[PDB]
Amino acid sequence: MLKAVILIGGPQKGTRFRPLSFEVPKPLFPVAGVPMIQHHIEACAQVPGMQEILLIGFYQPDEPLTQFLEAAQQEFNLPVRYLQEFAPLGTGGGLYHFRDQILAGSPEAFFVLNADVCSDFPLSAMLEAHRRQRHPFLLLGTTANRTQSLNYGCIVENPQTHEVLHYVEKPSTFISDIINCGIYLFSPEALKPLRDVFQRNQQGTIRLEQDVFSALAGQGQIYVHLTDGIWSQIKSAGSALYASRLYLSRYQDTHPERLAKHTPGGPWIRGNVYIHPTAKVAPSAVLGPNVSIGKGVTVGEGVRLRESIVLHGATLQEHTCVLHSIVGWGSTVGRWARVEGTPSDPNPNDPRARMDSESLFKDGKLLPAITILGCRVRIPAEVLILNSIVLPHKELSRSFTNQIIL
Amino acid sequence: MLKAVILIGGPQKGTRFRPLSFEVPKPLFPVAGVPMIQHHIEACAQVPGMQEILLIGFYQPDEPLTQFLEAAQQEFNLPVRYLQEFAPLGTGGGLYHFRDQILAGSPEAFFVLNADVCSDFPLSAMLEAHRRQRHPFLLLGTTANRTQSLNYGCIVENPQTHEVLHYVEKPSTFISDIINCGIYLFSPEALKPLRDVFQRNQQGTIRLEQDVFSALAGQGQIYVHLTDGIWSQIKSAGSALYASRLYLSRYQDTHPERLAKHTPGGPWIRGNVYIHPTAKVAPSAVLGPNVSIGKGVTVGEGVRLRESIVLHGATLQEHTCVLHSIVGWGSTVGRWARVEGTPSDPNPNDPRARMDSESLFKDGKLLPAITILGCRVRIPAEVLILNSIVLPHKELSRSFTNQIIL
Amino acid sequence: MLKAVILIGGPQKGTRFRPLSFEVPKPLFPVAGVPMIQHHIEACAQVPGMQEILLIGFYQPDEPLTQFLEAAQQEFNLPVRYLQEFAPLGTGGGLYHFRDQILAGSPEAFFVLNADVCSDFPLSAMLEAHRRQRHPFLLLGTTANRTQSLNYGCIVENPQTHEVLHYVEKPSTFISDIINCGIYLFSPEALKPLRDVFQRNQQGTIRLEQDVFSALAGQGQIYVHLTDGIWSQIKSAGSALYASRLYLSRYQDTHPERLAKHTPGGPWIRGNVYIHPTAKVAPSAVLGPNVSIGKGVTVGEGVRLRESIVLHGATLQEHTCVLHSIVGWGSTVGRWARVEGTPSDPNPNDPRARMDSESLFKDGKLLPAITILGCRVRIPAEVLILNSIVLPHKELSRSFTNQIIL
Amino acid sequence: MLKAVILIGGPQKGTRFRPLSFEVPKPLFPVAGVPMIQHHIEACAQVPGMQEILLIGFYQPDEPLTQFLEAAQQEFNLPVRYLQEFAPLGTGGGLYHFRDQILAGSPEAFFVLNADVCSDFPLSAMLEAHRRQRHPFLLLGTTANRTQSLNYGCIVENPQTHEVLHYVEKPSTFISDIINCGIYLFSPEALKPLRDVFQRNQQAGTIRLEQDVFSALAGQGQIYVHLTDGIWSQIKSAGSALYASRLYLSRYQDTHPERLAKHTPGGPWIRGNVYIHPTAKVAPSAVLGPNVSIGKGVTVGEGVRLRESIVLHGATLQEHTCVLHSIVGWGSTVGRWARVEGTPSDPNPNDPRARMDSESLFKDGKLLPAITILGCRVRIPAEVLILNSIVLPHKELSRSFTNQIIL
């Protein structure tokens, strides 16, 4: 018997992902058609013997969250429950504070998953290593580029014994090539170190990486497990496009019916394209690679979309070109209007990619990134939105280039 | 009998050059301690025979606005009402649509005041000139620079009879130096030409400057009353701060009990400083020139505040320096933290410089201006915020420079 | 060219519709599957030459209302605008205040409807009756029971010239059999008497029935039109069920595809039943007469529904019996539960029908009426709810009988 | 060092026997001028060595609750924290789930309080009688009527050793003459039996305190009683809220003699015990009867009679109104010559120990006459009578209603 704990953030952790997030929490953002935590829930429900799934966060319950829970319970034939912390307790304080709800039923091991990561989720292979070793902490890790590894948690391991010799969290200088994926496997004895940290804080927030993983490393408690599958973290609004591309390329092996076929009677389609069944697409339109269409989306007659997410309720009139952009809920694009962005993804393996910054401006000028359109944005006809971020419920009158429209 | 009509805007029409407040309406933004239209309401209540005050604008009636109306009605002992347009009808369209509510009671004349101007309001002088000549339109006029005049509406007049011979609205070329100040006096005959404009629109929305003033100019219907006192327009954040400086310097002649005295036992005050009675300022704090403190603000030990505006409920901890910045309500600044902005101001060599306002991006580069902190923004300890706009409900963790922090 | 003005109420008028008015506004409550003003809009759009439909009411434009406007414009190919009053101006004060928007384009005539009536809407026949006489006010009137006529406004008419000699609004004692149907037809200078009332109020709210109709009665200005078609008014929660019965019986003449077919595969159907296409009904279920089913409704095995409205999102489990009840949005009825009401139709021809007081209690006992279940009300298994009103977001544990659950 | 735990409820678990507060949460409803739990917090401030106050309950945190928390924190010089359960965990499950936050700082004993009781709060006397024997559970208990004790939880006590031998929760038959107050004193080891109950459930983690812990440990030397004679009623419905406001206003003359309004011949006429907020503007022709509370910003007109009422903040009574036995919600307006009346059931006058029972809305399928509730922003027109009636919020009336619930 195993269960899974998905750490979703609160409303403050979603402020980095703020322009898109006003309408819905960051874990309920539709990445490649389905919500972000739904990939985690589905990959946990595909594991044999999963009894329950608990979501630990400090979001207040509203209709999006509980509607998602009521949908996912009947979809995956599993109880999906939401435990709410009273305060922001850190990454590990929420795991320790709900220890009775986690250990209820006495599970043999429980997974712990960050909500922001888009990954392969090879939970079965981690389970087959964990049944071989039966050790308190198992960490999914992956190799990253030497300049990109400084932003993630670095793990120095011994290659023969698969054990964390050392752990440094977001180091200033180079430590190791392997990074922490943010997916862990916990034994039931793994709540015994966390408890000690709680006692040390009184003589009630526990950060899992900086307190548990750093001190426990090298003493035989923490073991690594390396995957070579796809991994990325969704920390910003423009990283959701790259994670959606990763999921749409992953979709061939898992869900071949989700990607749209070419359909020579219907709209021309190149690359991997997800189209929702409710979405009305004109047959004159062509959809380039890595494109997701939401439910109830009307796409006009002659429209080009490439590397773009069109959220649900949005409306694209005819003759428009949308490259590298996220069109929010109910947003309207007038005819002959181009909405462009420049490609930029975390891409830890790659050296060219600009690494994580909360800044967004280099020296008083906006960095080239993914164009975001918030909720209910009315773009007029024959107008260009290039490299630009538009706040919700804003109608534009002329063409904006490289600006944030407040 | 006279009433006065204040043209408060709508939410879309504000389109702030720097957003002084993301969550409160622009006409309720506290300039020099009291809300922006409370200056208009008070200067209108000083005029003899003022029966009523109307506010025309298409804001939806949120409880802050109605609560302000509750306060102002019993403060000035005048009925203050809010008439909401059904749609954005333009500057003069809302006057014509609500002609039955303004004309009821048969006023002798009625004022029309823009909500965004910060002025002397010499309404009695305009009333004396209007009682002398009884002409239908009276316009306040001010003298401006040759470069700065292209932003306002220029007025060419006959200098002897003080009648407008030509009017032009934001011209591309230089026309005249006198600018319209957004303060007018309307005789009851003056709703008759507006009606004429409405019929030409059928062959809804009437722009008062472009359709009434710029068409009837020279035909003996529009007269300009020149004036001398302080005038600025509250378009952006920096112009709001400069208007607050103008009102704090004006307070010496009218409300000497509003400015904080020197008070050697309490906190140090240089220059003109408004401190609310409910705000508790530590006696080691020193508040520089042109500083407004709101209700419930707890300015800590050792704080320096220069050229700032602190909204209600913000807390500043020990040893913090706040220069040229607007602090949103409920915001927390940690100890040794510095919030700085750049005062664009007005030229010191120009004879009549009117302090222009620029919309956030010079030529595709973000320009340095007043630092805006949103509502409930937590600035952490020992950190620097420089030339930044911080969106609400965001807790920072590192120093930011020349950035819009989403 | 004709126009049509529908006086939807405000939030003050929907209070007599409280259980169902907490979630949606009153004019958007679905009567016989479609919203209450959709019947008005479709019967006005079937009239040839109709240009525009205006809705006058002091509701705030919430996203349900604006979403209905956007949907109705593209459904009926007719522009539907919503003109919002600044204050509650009565039945005719809003018609006078928006006179320029109503008379825009010089329409030949414009209908005036009340949003709460449920009727045949024979606007074509009223137009043909209008075009011969060409009089300012054309009133629709029907025959009613002498007991029931004291609740509606009464019209004493001349049989020879079809003219209102006498009008009494809500009479104490009996005056005439004919009652006002709440549908009017207005000629262009019929707004000229209305203006006179405004001037008489200056020594501006205009009640249309008491100030205009009762004053102009007998002066040759008001004319009657007599109808035999179906008519009811929806003033209360239980009146919407009777109006749904009348509209489902009217559907056979106009929209025979909306009624559900008997269906060998489908649930046994007697009488008039509307089922939405998205709704899912088990084959063992049986839906009796006058039953409307909303979208997304899951009806379990062996359910019996008779004279009930099941709004959208509601789930009824197995073997449940529901009679004379209104099931709220997302309200859940557990298995074997019986939700029963007693029929209290308004029915102005019927002599023993109730007076439609808003009292709901006779002498401390709740009168038998329709069983309203609020929005998101969960009913447990094997629990009877008889003649009750359940407020929204409630969860019950035991059987209630003749009670308001607060 | 002590701390105190106040078990405020949640929205659903109340099931208010008369729906007094349609949008203000039940702990924050003002009883005798200040909020209902503030009387707890004030009393918990007077105990020496009191560190913290924890409010455990499953209301979502929003503006009225957190505004009250900030105001009470800066007023009483105490840290007041709100701990929120994820689900309704019941009376003892709240104390078990948040046990790390309760035991932090190692308190020597902690008080547990029901939030709906209006009481004397004799916390220091309980503390002395606890320190003499040092036992895990100490229960405040009072004497009650023989037929009225079936609503409360009854306690069978040994008179010599002051120990419970049998606790029954809301019994049908008669059990004992002593009832549980809802004020408890817990040892640090008092969380040790609670854990046992949690383990017994594993062979939503919800522990009812009174039915599991107290009815299991009874007669084993764990639970002891403390008998008091001071004032006690439980604020379950609206009528008991008026009676609790009366008890607190009569008790105010010892603790807070400055809160009751004086007779003040220059100001309004006052008989009985009246609380008047400083912001409230009352004309001098108004005469305010006994047991009347006035919230902040209330403008009471000329000639207004107010008897046995509670007027929440921002209400407006125009001239010549008469308001008896009713609760006027916040922001609501009553026009001139309008009479708003109710009927107070009270306690039996003959019975020697009679407490107010909070009857439900319906006696026998019919509405029983009780206190008149006006919701918030209710506009009562001029010259109209509301009698024994409940008006839902944001309603405008035009005629006189009697014995009705107006939706």
Ligand SMILES: Nc1nc2c(ncn2[C@@H]2O[C@H](COP(=O)(O)OP(=O)(O)O[C@H]3O[C@H](CO)[C@@H](O)[C@H](O)[C@@H]3O)[C@@H](O)[C@H]2O)c(=O)[nH]1
């Ligand atoms: N319950 C709870 N959950 C939280 C909290 N704070 C964050 N979470 C969730 O915890 C996960 C990570 O939290 P972060 O603090 O934002 O860490 P990070 O900057 O994203 O980096 C972590 O994950 C990376 C991979 O995504 C790792 O590479 C890195 O080492 C570290 O583990 C996210 O799902 C976040 O929503 C909290 O206070 N309480």
Ligand SMILES: Nc1nc2c(ncn2[C@@H]2O[C@H](COP(=O)(O)OP(=O)(O)O[C@H]3O[C@H](CO)[C@@H](O)[C@H](O)[C@@H]3O)[C@@H](O)[C@H]2O)c(=O)[nH]1
């Ligand atoms: N009711 C209503 N009011 C409006 C609307 N649009 C603007 N207002 C209000 O009308 C005032 C001026 O509107 P603008 O159209 O933005 O004028 P401007 O660019 O600011 O310049 C005007 O004022 C200057 C001084 O402030 C003048 O110098 C200039 O001539 C012009 O009149 C502002 O307070 C604005 O809030 C509207 O559609 N409806």
Ligand SMILES: Nc1nc2c(ncn2[C@@H]2O[C@H](COP(=O)(O)OP(=O)(O)O[C@H]3O[C@H](CO)[C@@H](O)[C@H](O)[C@@H]3O)[C@@H](O)[C@H]2O)c(=O)[nH]1
């Ligand atoms: N815009 C606006 N609409 C209003 C207002 N007040 C009422 N309405 C709308 O006006 C219509 C009737 O208003 P009532 O005042 O409640 O009249 P009534 O009790 O329904 O009786 C009227 O209608 C009956 C049939 O519906 C008639 O039988 C009767 O004669 C009378 O005309 C309803 O659609 C209501 O929503 C208002 O202040 N503003």
Ligand SMILES: Nc1nc2c(ncn2[C@@H]2O[C@H](COP(=O)(O)OP(=O)(O)O[C@H]3O[C@H](CO)[C@@H](O)[C@H](O)[C@@H]3O)[C@@H](O)[C@H]2O)c(=O)[nH]1
């Ligand atoms: N944290 C939390 N608190 C709760 C919960 N449910 C109720 N409370 C609070 O616990 C207190 C009592 O809970 P009840 O279950 O309603 O008990 P009761 O019917 O009022 O009777 C109790 O109190 C009486 C006197 O107040 C006692 O006579 C009786 O013995 C019993 O203890 C009230 O403050 C209630 O708000 C809950 O699920 N979680």
